[PDB]
Amino acid sequence: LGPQVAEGENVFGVCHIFASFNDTFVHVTDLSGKETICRVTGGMKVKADRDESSPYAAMLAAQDVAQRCKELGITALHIKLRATGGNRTKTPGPGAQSALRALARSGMKIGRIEDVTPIPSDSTRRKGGRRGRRL
């Protein structure tokens, strides 16, 4: 079922935290990244558009993710936090910090923390006009 090898050591996964300003993704996956353990977003925890990116929704999603990973044998997590990136914003959304803190607070062990938002060497045009969005 799970790795019951060397109970005294850590089993490491990778948590890809995608914190956009619309909602937040808490995605724990294999060490290589190909196999996924569980992905719980903030939108499957709140029934309203606005709170999809809220810190509370991210805390709930991270709690469920950590519960599933603990019941699946994974004990420690490497963090790969990303914002939307591209030509859009590079600042992580409101739920990133709360998701990370909820992962740490719910009995998970944190490994290396890395920021992986996609940064262009230079990009295509942004979705706004030349005068920007005026609201």
């Binding site: 740490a104 490994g111 290396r112 923390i113 920021d115 706004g128 006009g129 030349r130 920007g132």
Partner: protein, 99 residues
């Protein structure tokens, strides 16, 4: 009447400056005129530093920082209160805020 001697931008001895996009509205603003903020912030907020540190596998990990360069149009930089309007005399002060 001329409000600023540099016309609100930092262009001397050249004709054209490549534009950039405001981080808020995506307005096309010249790079010299745009208001630039370099934010070096910890990935883990100060409230969560202790909780992340305890759950760390490695002792003495020193958490990474975030390096984001912010470009602002004049409208968004004024609205966000990064810059404020100043008096006719204090406008000339180019020293960055002591913080």
């Amino acid at each position: 009447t001329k409000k600023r001697r540099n016309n609100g931008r930092a262009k001397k001895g050249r004709g054209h400056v490549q534009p950039i996009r405001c981080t808020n509205c995506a307005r096309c603003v010249p790079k010299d005129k745009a208001i630039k903020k370099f934010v070096i912030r910890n990935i883990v907020e100060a409230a969560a530093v202790r909780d992340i540190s305890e759950a760390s596998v490695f002792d003495a990990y020193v958490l990474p920082k975030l390096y984001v360069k912010l470009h602002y149009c004049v409208s968004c930089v004024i609205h966000s209160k990064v810059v404020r309007n100043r008096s006719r005399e204090a406008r000339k002060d180019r020293t960055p805020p002591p913080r």
